[PDB]
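Troubleshooting entry. The earlier prediction with 2F5 gave an output that would not parse, so I re-checked the input for stray whitespace and re-submitted. Clean input:
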Amino acid sequence: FTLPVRLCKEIELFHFDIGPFENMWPGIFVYMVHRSCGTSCFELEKLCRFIMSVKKNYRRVPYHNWKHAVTVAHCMYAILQNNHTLFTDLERKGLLIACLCHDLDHRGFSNSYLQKFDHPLAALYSTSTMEQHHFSQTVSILQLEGHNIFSTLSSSEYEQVLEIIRKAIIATDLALYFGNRKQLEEMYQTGSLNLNNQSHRDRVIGLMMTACDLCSVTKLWPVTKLTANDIYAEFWAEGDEMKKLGIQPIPMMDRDKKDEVPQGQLGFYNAVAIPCYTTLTQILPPTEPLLKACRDNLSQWEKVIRGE
Amino acid sequence: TLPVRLCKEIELFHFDIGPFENMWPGIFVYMVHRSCGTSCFELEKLCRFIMSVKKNYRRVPYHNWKHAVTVAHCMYAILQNNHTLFTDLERKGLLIACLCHDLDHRGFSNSYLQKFDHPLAALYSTSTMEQHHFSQTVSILQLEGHNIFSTLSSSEYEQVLEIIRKAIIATDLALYFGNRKQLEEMYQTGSLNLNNQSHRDRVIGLMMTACDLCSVTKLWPVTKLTANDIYAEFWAEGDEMKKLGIQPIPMMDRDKKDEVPQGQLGFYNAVAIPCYTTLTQILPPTEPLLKACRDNLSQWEKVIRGE
Ligand SMILES: O=C(c1ccc(Oc2nccnc2N2CCOCC2)cc1)c1nc2ccccc2[nH]1
Ligand SMILES: O=C(c1ccc(Oc2nccnc2N2CCOCC2)cc1)c1nc2ccccc2[nH]1
Ligand SMILES: [Zn+2]
Ligand SMILES: [Zn+2]
Ligand SMILES: [Zn+2]
Ligand SMILES: [Zn+2]
């Protein structure tokens, strides 16, 4: 498993696409962990066994699948490589893993639908339902024989990296991003923001997770547009299921409103995506290429609205 | 509050603090209050400290009170554009360190002192003047009503005094070469880590070098005029070498003043550009220091040709 010449070069770029060849993705992840963390961070036999078991617990859904897991992990890699001196030894181990596992066992449905349907996970986890489950799955996979990639850490170190991972996976709940960014934006403008404060640090990691999870909007236009087809294929399926409960779904998830997709994306870029990468770039300036691509894609969506 | 123009231009890296000596203390207080906050030091006590520091700098061409306040401003600019990295203690201590870092400088290098057989060279065998600078800082803090860190706990007071000590010692330019080479390797391999204390000390050591040489990052007129003051000290030291029967290096020899352009060219190539290059790699927001340094190198090339 040696990475080809075009891949070694272009994996350093934020807008890299991991390609259609599924069996190279495990190798691509190991390359990223070895460059970001080091070759002696993990026992290689355990890591691959952990990687393949994680792959097995992702589902064949249009968007929230194995490819998305690795794509999110890669965005994080690109953030780590360009802000590398900021992160602790534990963060260098736990963040890439958190990103790989952050949508483990996704059904293809929102937290909202799980509540409406009354799914068992909704009763077990009231807030951030899928996210608490994703972490639960991550812990459950670590406890399989030979899957403890953190076995050489002390007890203290093990509990700390699992907390990092937990908070990071929970932060991928988009309902928490709005409040979190507001705080960060306020902390940055008043100059109170400080990475040596653990709570402030958690918030910045939480924003990084959001930025990685939304990174499809920071790719080149063709990747962004084609990835959009997979996102809506899931939402339209959820809206179909909402109608089967006798509930009118929001326009976002109604396939009968395909025509309004460009306007819906433009609304999302202005209200969510642009603010996320704007604030991230203020806190971490080397992440600007993400913001730059998001603005280029914003311009393309309004180019589609005008009909050109 | 400062006048409107200073408020705006003090945030710029290439800011010059001006000829008005009695505005410099107020410039420093302003910088301290924006980096750290308005409730870090007791103002009356801080002003008393500053004027005692002022009184213990000497009337020499370059290593004077103006140098001290100018170095502190570069550190202020660095801290303001990398505000999230450093703690409250580190911001407090680094500005103060910068202000105190050349305390009681005579206008002579360590090598002259050890070759003259000066008492300080017997006391401090390595980084002679630098160990003296810190020693002077401690003496000023020990005076009645001068301990600006009196609100701190003992634990915190010791931490900031170590920050100040290490930072001042790093301004020994003989330590810079080793420090930069180590940071370059750690940056390339990816092992560089600011949460590692020893690594963090080195980055601060490089920041101190960068602030200390910041005359090369100003606009050309400032950079060129400041060079007259630097060479005035060096030539005076070169005269003292000749007094001892020792032929000084061309750097300190006033007979070879027409080689200055080439001497400066070689300094930028070998010390200054590599310093700010490495600093920009580790802290990208300090990039304007590099650009400006590159621009002044162009000017020195332009002087050598005659253009
Ligand atoms: O805001 C919309 C919206 C917001 C976010 C969406 O998901 C994502 N889009 C781009 C990138 N990433 C997205 N997510 C990925 C999966 O997790 C949630 C965010 C889709 C539509 C939206 N509103 C609409 C109204 C009518 C028709 C279509 C509409 N679309
Ligand atoms: O390299 C020189 C050199 C290097 C550094 C110098 O001092 C500084 N110049 C610019 C900015 N900062 C300087 N220092 C400030 C004080 O501490 C030492 C560095 C001067 C000449 C140098 N070599 C020369 C040979 C002949 C004639 C003149 C020569 N000059
Ligand atoms: Zn998710
Ligand atoms: Zn996700
Ligand atoms: Zn000095
Ligand atoms: Zn100095």
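This one parsed fine. Chain B touches chain A through 14 residues (CB under 8 Å).
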